[PDB]
Design a protein around this ligand. Structure first.
Ligand SMILES: N[C@H](CCC(=O)O)C(=O)O
Ligand SMILES: N[C@H](CCC(=O)O)C(=O)O
Ligand SMILES: N[C@H](CCC(=O)O)C(=O)O
Ligand SMILES: N[C@H](CCC(=O)O)C(=O)O
Lengths: 312, 314, 315, 312
């Protein structure tokens, strides 16, 4: 039986010793122990909190008493945390992040079976080397590109590229493998990362002005994620500010709020080569912010950052 | 005999000269009597509130003409969904209004704009379109202009609703499967005739480690309402809540939307105490649609309870 | 003052148990309705008969005619829930709410879906916004039309989908509507369970590579009055099958072209087959099992293929 | 430039030299020649057509001067041909199957760009080793589990497990890899198959009887795909007939007409171990028919068939 550690951080899914005893079936599939890393509403997570989790995961992944890791998380920023760990945890021990749409007290609460599934997946040989996984709604989803896409409903977490597998009666069924760099094959490592650069997001829409972009740069943004309309499109009213910001050294990364499929193509809506800007590829704005913040611990070259947005 | 449809051109990839747009689809003559006006020529990502008003006012003039049976607007994809929702709210006409764009220019291999334009004119000329509110006719679908959104990049199936298409248009014929449930057009309390300016409304994104910086800056630079594009069920970071309380007391409306746009909606009092803070939830409306509804609504009211009702009815 | 809701139990994984145990399992039902139960049958829905549908339809009609009933819930196996819901949508001439509900997991399983699905079914059945909307299905916090919801995803609780989207959602017992039905149903239907004592025999044959006329001929030989063709693509028919279907039509068997292309679009008349020349019918957007229900009900009234096609275009 | 061969089989997309003439941009990206292998409406395809195509593909894959192959195909059984090839073609040269939803004479016809993208993917080194691919609507879809899911519209082809990539301006962007056995790692080879076993499909629905199942076996079926309700469920009126056919040597494979996601679970709805039946896992009835025909060229052991249905 695999040794699995549950790291509790908070969220609608939640005292971690109670949490575990509340699912006695876990003892059947793994030797489980729990730790409370933090106790937060995930919409209120800070970069300090994400680093603390990254570090504690890394200490446990190096432990020989540890075969797999489950992180219980609020839904709101689950996808951010999952992508972060996918970039910085250089381990091929399974890492699973899991949450719930309903509290354990509610009628037909989803957390119990989610937590069982997460433990089952974290204890499975098939999970090794696959990168960070999310196990809600009987699905095995990639930590890279899974997002909270539907509110209220238990099927909240979706990817444009589909689920990789399913978990049913504690067994894993795989249909797809990841194509993007992660974990063991990442050039980033939480062991060398003690801090993260400031990165912020501004939204594009009808009649948008340069105000948010300038303010976020004035208050410390080292990169801005542009959550554009369409294919990362930028208002003629905002282009001149982004050019001035890039000249002051702020990276300009074009994402979009067009999140169900496709990607943002370099040089299509804007002259990225000429302006020395970066396209976020298929990554939504929150995900683009996590990859930018991790990438900028290593490089400030816009051409290297574009390679990173195309490989991870 | 044939319906009189006017095509109002605003720009976009579908035109990437209204007379050549129309010459480029000879078959339009089989299905309608068509004429074109260039209202403007823009990239829709650059659209302004003055452009919306100008368009809205032109549409209303044509809707009031006995020589106009239906109206097609050709438009860039990027903010098409915003224009369509705006018109659905302010045009008090049962006459069809159809908004249409394309994902490829007319010169591209397998360009989508010719059939999209034929289908928009067919829908604008069809009796079944009357009273339905504003429609968008891309990818053979009849989508509601209220809740269709550009949800897929690059592909021709770019426009999707959480509540499904209402119908399809094939070989110029409309096939209906659903009807609108929300207030629109003829049953709207809003009227472009009585709107001479729109209040400034801005949007700020919610994410891990977000600060109150954009919220304050946008308010300092004139926003009368802020659309919070929150994580999850419109959730607000405990770091930002005090700023949004101070802004609401300063008179700025706080509307909780989300970046969780494929289905569900934001529930009042669930993630934040809205009643206690005098905030509004945007229900199912994504941030850019919540901005349009806030802007139109605040031409008539600043009562947060009336705003909430309006977000539950439109 | 609470609404009177009756639960008609028929079996399924939601009861994996008497109706009295289903009601006892959700003690919060007492807060939103005066609930009563009746065990109509205890079956696996994959095993349902036409006699079971008729029986359930007549129980629904008597309860809908009762001044002491405000709404009706049917608990049902998932497998043919979509078939029961569409059948009731065609033959029940009541504006009273009729809700069909099931579960993917039994009540003793971890994170079982049944309790909340049954709470929400009763909530919707009790709500005045549900009146006049036709038969509803309330799973996964959704209000789905009984006309065109189908079991589309195995295992997961989001099993039930419509090509035309959910019509609303049910959250904390409250109903939130975003679309209305367009097609004819219930109070504006030309069909009535009160005038139906038997259902014509209707069967389904599948289209695929190398398919032959075998299944079509055997089903007609063993009494089918109509064959639903589950075609490839736009209800396409193999050149190896067309001759047999011409002969079956010539001999009185209606030929209805549906498809196994079930996530969107519909089957277009005269596009893949000359339906006018052949006197055949297209099933529009209806999947094969739904088309069989509509065909069955329609042929209680007409054997005229142009009336059948009008029906497939209006319901 | 890669040498790509286009094999025309018919369909709405379409003689092959006018097909190629129709897309003059093709010469820019590969050296293309056509052959007309057949001219059929794909709804009327036979087992002999599949074998003739599969053999012609295998000869071209062996040739030194062929870098990749495109098949132009009617949409109706495109998903059956694509899967068949994925199972029997032992090459890691790209094979791409492509059709169109509208004829080339129609307003906004999809066939020109679909044919361009197919040739582009067929000429890309990224396509080697990936299995058979389908390239419509700008997507790279797996031949294994892509299915005609939407009528009329150009987004007709979908997979429960999502697109593996996209093709844009002739360039391939990958996000997922296949997990199931295909082409070079398949235990099947078209070189050894002279004719396929007869396999038929019967539909499950309310008030279904054993008639179709009986008539198909009486007329030569060696396996029956049951297109069940739900999780491959079987009516109590049908089970006895299927026990009797299994006893007389006919394989019984439980598929479903629940085709948007999930799969059919062994022993859940029916006692497959006791009955010596097989479940089709996630494969839809027409795909499970292809796999049953191929598997049965090799084995008649139901435990080996179940293994095959779990690995392919
Ligand atoms: N406050 C939200 C609760 C959402 C959830 O976990 O369902 C969080 O921790 O993200
Ligand atoms: N610049 C974009 C082009 C997008 C399009 O129309 O496809 C616009 O006008 O919205
Ligand atoms: N035997 C199946 C059980 C499936 C379920 O209800 O989830 C039926 O009754 O339809
Ligand atoms: N009869 C169909 C035509 C449909 C199409 O290819 O779009 C075929 O050859 O499969």
């Amino acid at each position: 039986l695999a040794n699995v550690v549950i790291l509790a951080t908070g969220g609608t899914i939640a005292g971690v010793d109670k949490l575990i005893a509340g699912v006695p079936e876990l003892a059947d599939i793994a030797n489980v122990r729990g730790e409370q890393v933090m106790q937060i509403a995930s919409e209120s997570i800070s970069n300090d909190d994400l680093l603390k989790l990254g570090k504690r995961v890394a200490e446990l992944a190096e432990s020989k008493d540890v075969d797999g890791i489950v992180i219980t998380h609020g839904t709101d920023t689950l996808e951010e945390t999952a992508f972060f760990l996918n970039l910085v945890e250089k381990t091929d021990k399974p890492i699973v992040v899991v949450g719930s749409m309903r509290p354990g007290t509610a009628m037909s609460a989803d957390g119990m079976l989610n937590l069982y599934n997460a433990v089952a997946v974290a204890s499975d040989k098939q999970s090794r080397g696959k990168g960070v996984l999310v196990t809600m709604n009987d699905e095995i989803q990639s930590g890279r590109d899974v997002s909270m896409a539907v509110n209220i409903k238990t099927e909240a977490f979706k990817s444009a590229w589909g689920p990789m597998g399913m978990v049913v009666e504690g067994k894993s069924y795989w249909f797809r493998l990841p194509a993007k760099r992660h974990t063991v094959n990442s050039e980033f490592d939480i062991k060398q990362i003690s801090s993260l650069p400031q990165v912020d997001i501004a939204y594009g829409y009808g009649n948008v002005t340069d105000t948010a972009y300038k303010a976020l740069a004035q208050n410390g943004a080292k990169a801005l994620i542009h959550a554009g309309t369409g294919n990362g499109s930028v208002s003629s009213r905002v282009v001149p500010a982004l050019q001035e910001l890039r000249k002051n050294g702020v990276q300009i990364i074009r994402s979009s709020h067009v999140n169900q499929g496709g990607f943002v193509l370099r040089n299509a809506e804007q002259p990225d080569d000429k302006n020395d800007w970066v396209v976020a590829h298929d990554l939504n704005p929150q995900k683009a912010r996590i990859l930018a913040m991790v990438a900028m611990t290593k490089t400030q070259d816009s051409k290297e950052l574009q390679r990173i947005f195309w490989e991870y």
